[PDB]
């Protein structure tokens, strides 16, 4: 249980949290997962690109 989470500071910076879901739905969960792997966001499942 974290001190505070990155999502909480998004409204502070000026980006609403619901916008993340907008991007996710726009990407389509296929290209989104491919890109999320590519950016190294999932250590359990990574390959050299």
């Amino acid at each position: 249980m974290e001190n505070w989470s990155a999502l909480e500071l998004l409204p502070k910076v000026g980006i609403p949290t619901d916008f993340l879901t907008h991007v996710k739905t726009s990407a389509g969960e296929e290209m989104f997962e491919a890109l999320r792997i590519y950016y190294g966001d999932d250590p359990e499942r990574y390959n050299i690109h």
């Binding site: 990407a27 389509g28 296929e30 290209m31 491919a34 590519y38 250590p43 359990e44 990574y46 390959n47």
Partner: protein, 98 residues
């Protein structure tokens, strides 16, 4: 000897783990004689365990970014409004070997 080694940039946390949650840190290799001496001398700390290891080799994966470079080249090279692969209906799809 084990402590002095620096860790690697890549390390999958799910691979090479024992039956318990313990993570394997590395491997010691030596000739048969050295291993016999160690296993006799330090038998208390030695133990035989089952280890989950990668079943198969890793794959070649093509970076999603290089699609953007190709599309930029086509933007320069293709005829006026002749190129159409960059826009489509439905879910977007990059060519992949998954």
């Amino acid at each position: 000897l084990a402590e002095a080694a620096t860790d690697s940039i890549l390390d999958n946390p799910t691979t090479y783990t024992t039956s318990s949650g313990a993570k394997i840190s590395g491997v010691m290799v030596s000739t048969a004689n050295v291993m016999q001496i160690i296993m006799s001398l330090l038998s208390s700390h030695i133990t035989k365990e089952t280890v989950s290891a990668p079943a198969t080799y890793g794959n070649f994966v093509l970076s999603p970014e290089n699609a953007v470079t190709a599309i930029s080249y086509h933007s320069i090279l293709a005829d006026f409004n002749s190129y159409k692969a960059h826009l489509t209906s439905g879910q977007p799809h990059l060519p992949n070997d998954s």
